[model samples]
Target: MPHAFKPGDLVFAKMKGYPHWPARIDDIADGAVKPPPNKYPIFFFGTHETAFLGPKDLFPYDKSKDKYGKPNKRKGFNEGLWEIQNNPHASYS
Candidate 1:
């Protein structure tokens, strides 16, 4: 039941448990992933390093799911993932 989405598509996703929470779509995988259960590009509204999100926490999610499968509520900075901010390695202040 997943719906198709394109780049720059303005959409909203309901946060698990907190139905009132809002999130945006920022990224999308144009192709499929490797191995079984290939995953599509997961669109995000914020940096994964600064916000607490799970593998399933994203917009345009698979409608086949519960629509709001509460994955995790504990919030914190995610490692390795990307962040939408000024270059931290830059020397300029």
Candidate 2:
């Protein structure tokens, strides 16, 4: 099945209750490898965190429950981290 979300798309982890921590889609772990059912190799980052989350810890934010299950709107720190990691200034931390 095709991925429900893409890069730059907003999402959240599958947590209990209504709203969950907001995050943004980054990319898949394996570009060519097929993702298993409900097991997409998603890369994302939380709104207020600087670290880029790996695929094993990601879950696609469901769009159907936008009202009660909407993700809180917030700024993300991962984009900058992602930039630094992918740019010429890439350095191990």
Choose the strongest candidate by lDDT: 2
Report clash pairs, candidate 2.
none
Error of 2 at 1 (Å): 1.8
lDDT of 2 by residue, 2-21 (tens): 45455655445433342344
Alpha-carbon local distance difference test for all models: 0.32, 0.41
Q: Please state every model's RMSD to the true fold in angstroms.
A: 10.3, 8.9
lDDT of 1 by residue, 5-65 (tens): 4433333333455331223333433673322242323233233321334335444323422
Give the lowest summed-lDDT range of ten residues in model 1.
Answer: 76-85
lDDT for 92 (candidate 1): 19
TM value for model 1: 0.26
Distance from true location, Cα of 48 in model 1, Å:
3.1
* Model 2 misplaced stretches (Cα beyond 4 Å): 14-20, 26-47, 63-93
lDDT of 2 at 39: 49
